[PDB]
Write a protein that binds this ligand. Structure first.
Ligand SMILES: *[C@@H]1O[C@H](CO)[C@@H](O)[C@H](O)[C@H]1NC(C)=O
Lengths: 48, 49
């Protein structure tokens, strides 16, 4: 009925009605950083 | 979900360039590496030294 990964995490699943297998991928995420030349000079910022 | 690997600041090409520049400077120049003499000491003279 489903597949699993090395960490025993689900990667695929058979649809309950249509016996077909759908791939699963975690939604994309990441950290956030802020760049500043110093408030002593300006107030512009850029993010990454 | 929660683990991330960050890239190193210096890429491989930069490391290779640093090594190439260092070795070229040590080979072409001799005991004059550092100070910008920039003339070219013959290699056999360095070997004799
Ligand atoms: C930073 O602030 C000091 C006073 O707090 C000022 O004297 C200095 O010029 C400032 N530096 C810049 C780059 O604006």
């Amino acid at each position: 009925q489903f597949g699993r990964d090395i960490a025993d995490t689900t990667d695929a699943v058979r649809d309950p009605q249509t016996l077909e297998i759908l791939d699963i991928t975690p939604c994309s995420f990441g950290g956030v950083s802020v760049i500043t030349p110093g408030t002593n000079t300006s107030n512009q910022v850029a993010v990454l | 979900n929660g683990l991330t690997v960050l890239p190193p600041l210096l890429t491989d090409e930069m490391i290779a360039a640093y090594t190439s520049a260092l070795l070229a400077g040590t080979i072409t120049a001799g005991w004059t590496f550092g100070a910008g003499a920039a003339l070219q000491i013959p290699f056999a003279m360095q070997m004799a030294y």
